[PDB]
Every structure is written in structure tokens, then in C-alpha cells.
């Protein structure tokens, strides 16, 4: 339906690559970019993405992750 943008800050100090591939492999994702000065944030764009499941998988497999933004932009 509506195009999403989701930004997640992830603690990933290999860890960046892992985090990015997990996000790419999530349902509904069209793109995944590293953003921020420290390249410690992930911007996800797509449709019908479930942010709750996405945050728990990141926390499960990679490290602490928190939602910075969710916008149906």
C-alpha cells in the first residue's frame, strides 16, 4: 500500500555488513542504506514492512537497535 521509510540506529562496531544483509532479507524491503556520520544508522525503504519484527531480529542477531523514524513517506 503505502511506501515506508524506517530509520534504525544500530550498535555495530562485519557487524555493519551483517546488520545490512539481515535488513535486506526482511519482507517488503526495496532498499537499505547506511547513513549518519558514524554510519551507525540504517535507512529502509519499501512496502508492508513490519518494524516490530525487524527491530527484534536486529536485537536478536546483531545488537541493540532502536527506531529513530517511521514515516509513510
Amino acid at each position: 500500500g503505502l511506501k515506508q521509510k524506517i530509520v534504525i540506529k544500530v550498535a555495530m562496531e562485519n557487524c555493519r555488513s551483517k546488520a545490512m544483509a539481515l535488513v535486506a532479507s526482511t519482507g517488503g524491503v526495496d532498499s537499505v542504506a547506511l547513513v549518519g556520520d558514524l554510519r551507525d544508522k540504517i535507512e529502509v525503504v519499501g512496502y508492508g514492512i513490519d518494524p516490530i519484527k525487524l527491530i527484534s531480529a536486529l536485537r536478536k542477531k546483531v545488537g541493540d537497535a532502536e527506531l529513530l523514524q517511521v514515516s509513510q513517506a
Partner: protein
């Protein structure tokens, strides 16, 4: 045998030990990459993951992609 790649993965650089990871783009979609302070709108066309600007022009030599 493996499924066809679903994404093209873009890098600034061609060498695994030094390249910088930029973005994953779903094959069949277009996305805007930000790199070296500029924007590049790419089309991830297929599993060969040629770097393709949506305006038909030549992309910079340093922009590389491979299938995931």
C-alpha cells in the same frame, strides 16, 4: 541450485579490503545512492548488477555493485 539474487549491493571501491558499503537495492527497483557528497539514481536491472544510472549516463568508475 541457489535462487536468483534478489538485490544489487553497491560499493564505493572495487577491492574487498578497502571498499565502502553503500546500499542494497532490490532487483527490479530504482533507488538514490548518496556517495562522495553526491546523489546517483541507479536501476538494479538484473543479477549481473551492472551499475546503471536511470538517466542513461555513465556512472563514476568507483561505483561498483554485485548480486546478493
Amino acid at each position: 541450485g541457489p535462487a536468483p539474487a534478489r538485490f544489487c549491493v553497491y560499493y564505493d571501491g572495487h577491492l574487498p579490503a578497502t571498499r565502502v558499503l553503500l546500499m542494497y537495492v532490490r532487483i527490479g527497483t530504482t533507488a538514490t545512492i548518496t556517495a562522495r557528497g553526491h546523489e546517483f539514481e541507479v536501476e538494479a536491472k538484473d543479477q549481473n548488477c551492472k551499475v546503471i544510472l536511470t538517466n542513461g549516463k555513465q556512472a563514476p568508475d568507483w561505483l561498483a555493485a554485485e548480486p546478493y
